Each structure stands twice: as C-alpha cells, then as structure tokens.
Design a protein around this ligand. Structure first.
Ligand SMILES: */C(=C\C(=O)OC)CNC(=O)c1c(C)n(C)c2ccc(OC)cc12
Length: 375
C-alpha cells in the first residue's frame, strides 16, 4: 500500500474539480461577528458545491488583499470561535488534556445546535478541499467516527488513563467477585450520576461471559451515545464537501494530520539530526537545557515551536534527517546569536533557531515560549 504522502496525492487526484459552479465563492464578514456571519453565509448557499469554488473572503470592508492569505486567516479565526468551549459545541476531553470532544449538553445552549454542527462539518470539509488546516485537535474517537471505524478500549488510554486501566483490569481478570453492575457512575457538580448501560442494568452482574459487552457499552456511553446527532450533523456537512468514499483511504492518524496537522513528534529523531554553530555544540549547557525544555512541552507546543523555526507545521517524510529549507536541503540547526535580554529569532528559509546563551533553564523557558506566542 501507499504511505501518507502517496495516499494524499492519490486522494487529491480523485477529488475532482467542480464544473457546474460559479468561479468563486464570495463572503463578506466582520471580525467581531465572524461566527454568526460565517454561519449565515455557509449555511445559506443554494448548494454545498458553491463552497468548492475559490474562496473570495473580505473582512470588515477591507478591500484588496491576497485571497489565498485572507482565507487562511479565516480558517484560523473561524476555528478559534467554533472550538471555543464558551459556546458549548465542543469541550476539552479532560481537565488535563488539550484535545476536544463534542459537548453532549450542546442542545441546552442552543436548541438549534445541530445545524451549527453541520456548519462546522462544512468548514472542516472546506479546509480539506482547499488544502488548509483547522486549528484544533480532536480526540482519536472523533476521527474514527468520521471513518466509521470502531472505537476501542485502546482509544480510552489517550483520553482517560485511569479509566482505561480499570477497564483493562476487568478485561484481563475475572471481575465477577467485584459484583459490578451494568451501570456507569459519573461525577458531575460534586454529585453521583448513575446511568443504565442496558435495560435493568443495575440488576445484571458483570462476569467473564458478558464483560466484552460491558466494555463496549461503557466505551459507547463515554464517546458515542450522548453525541450521535451532533456527530451525524458534522459528518453530513463534512461529506457535502468530501465524499466519504474518498476519506476512507486514510486512517485516524493520517486524517488528523490531513485536517489539523498533528501533533505527534519524535523528539529523539529531532535531536539526532540537528546542527550547532557559532560556538554551540552537541553537549553545550544551553543546548542541554533546550532539549530538556522541548521534552517537557505539550505536543501542541512542540509543533508551534517547529512552525516558528521551519515556516509551517509538517515534519518531513522519513523524519528529521530529510528536512528542507528554502534553497535545497537544510537540517534543523541552532546558532548562538545575540544576548540574553533579547528573545530567540527564526530564519524559516534556513530552518535555524538563533538562540542566545541563557544563564538559567527557566529563563530559557520564559523567553523561548514568548517568542512562539505569535502563530
Ligand atoms: C451555552 C452554555 C453552555 O456552554 O452549555 C453547553 C452557551 N452558548 C452560547 O451562548 C452561544 C452563543 C453566544 N452563540 C452565538 C452560539 C451559537 C451556537 C450555540 O450552539 C450550542 C451556542 C451559542
């Protein structure tokens, strides 16, 4: 089979251009109401295929800009809004994670919530159709639901590890003597909430004979049952732009990468194909601290550092041994430039981090992550 790169190019060949469509899609929005205005237009088009036209976007009556860049800005701005937990469509999967899942209480904000999921679906499809990325990472089960792949216990590990270990225990041992029932206790607002996994579930005991069912119903309750209509509205919109036949070529990792640009970076591969100049070296103290800092950063923040130094996020194929700059090949490198008072600067055309010789690890962390806060 093909690898991701060939897969993508194959996918692009199959995604045929739209003939029977106006040569552009005009929408004029206002930054302060970018959600309401984007929604109204994109959900108002005669046909979804109008969205496949080249994107002619205009913010606030500001006339005369490069539409390839204004659109990229829109994808960034509309993502920020759609995926803000304030609105109640999406919420963080856990207190300790940066990943997003559908909020099952979405309907309480807005009775009309489902049509907003279709909108988000269309915009996601538009990102994929025109080759731009959404700004936001979803939980793995979001990506599997899109591909109609089964949600597994393995998918619980990435989200909630303590809960995954209780269910793995149950899987690997006989739970009969625990006297567990076909119910789920949930903690909300400092109260206990018990839900039937099935009819008369409180009176049915979990054993080795029915536990595979048990684990399945749990996983469903956690990731599917309360969010079926929302996801189904999101998919309808998404599939109005990308035929679901075509998306099945990718698996859940490749799909995340396609839509959003993961998100899973081997820091060892990063470290062993790096150069050092202007006094720095493989074992210099400042460089040790740099590699410590990177190690402890969020996989989201590691990428935002890579975006800053490279140009955009997209680790090359075969790892960091084949990184390219502007003119030909260019390995990731660090140069001892400037003085501790100034932040680090990046030359994207030479994939190089100009890094001052800082005196402390925490100073390095302070200055490095300030200079990343821009993209
Ligand atoms: C509802 C409270 C909550 O988080 O419960 C799940 C808050 N959401 C909104 O007030 C809201 C606003 C201001 N806008 C423009 C919305 C559009 C769509 C939705 O759909 C859920 C909610 C919105």
């Amino acid at each position: 089979s093909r690898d991701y790169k060939r897969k993508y190019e194959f996918f692009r060949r199959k995604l045929k251009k739209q003939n029977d469509i106006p040569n552009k899609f005009e929408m004029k929005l206002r930054r302060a109401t970018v959600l309401e205005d984007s929604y109204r237009r994109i959900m108002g088009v005669k046909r979804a295929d109008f969205l496949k036209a080249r994107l002619w976007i205009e913010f606030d009556g500001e006339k005369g800009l490069d539409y390839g860049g204004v659109a990229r800005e829109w994808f960034f701005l509309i993502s920020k809004e759609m995926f803000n937990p304030y609105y109640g469509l999406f919420e963080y999967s856990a207190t300790d994670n940066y990943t997003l899942q559908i909020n099952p209480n979405s309907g309480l904000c807005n009775e009309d919530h489902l049509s907003y999921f279709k909108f988000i679906g269309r915009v996601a499809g538009m990102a994929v159709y025109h080759g731009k990325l959404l700004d936001g990472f979803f939980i793995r089960p979001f990506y599997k639901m899109m591909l109609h792949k089964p949600i597994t216990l393995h998918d619980m590990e990435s989200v909630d590890s303590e809960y995954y270990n209780s269910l793995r225990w149950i899987l690997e041992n006989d739970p009969t003597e625990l006297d567990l029932r076909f119910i789920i206790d949930e903690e909300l607002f400092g109260q206990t909430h018990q839900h039937e996994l099935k009819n008369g579930g409180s009176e049915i005991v979990v054993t080795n004979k029915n536990k595979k069912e048990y684990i399945y119903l749990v996983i469903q309750w956690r990731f599917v049952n309360r969010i079926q209509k929302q996801m189904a509205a999101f998919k309808e919109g998404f599939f109005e732009l990308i035929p679901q036949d075509l998306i099945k070529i990718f698996d859940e990792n490749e799909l995340e990468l396609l839509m959003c640009g993961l998100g899973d970076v081997d820091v060892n591969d990063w470290r062993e194909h790096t150069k050092y100049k202007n006094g720095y070296s493989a074992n210099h103290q400042v460089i040790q601290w740099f590699w410590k800092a990177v190690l402890m950063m969020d996989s989201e923040k590691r990428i935002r550092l890579l975006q800053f130094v490279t140009g955009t996020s997209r680790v090359p194929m075969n790892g960091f041994a084949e990184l390219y700059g502007s003119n030909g090949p260019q390995s990731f490198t660090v140069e001892q430039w400037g003085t501790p008072e100034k932040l680090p600067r990046a030359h994207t055309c030479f994939n190089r981090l100009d890094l001052p010789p800082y005196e402390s690890f925490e100073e390095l962390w302070d200055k490095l992550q300030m200079a990343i806060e821009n993209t």
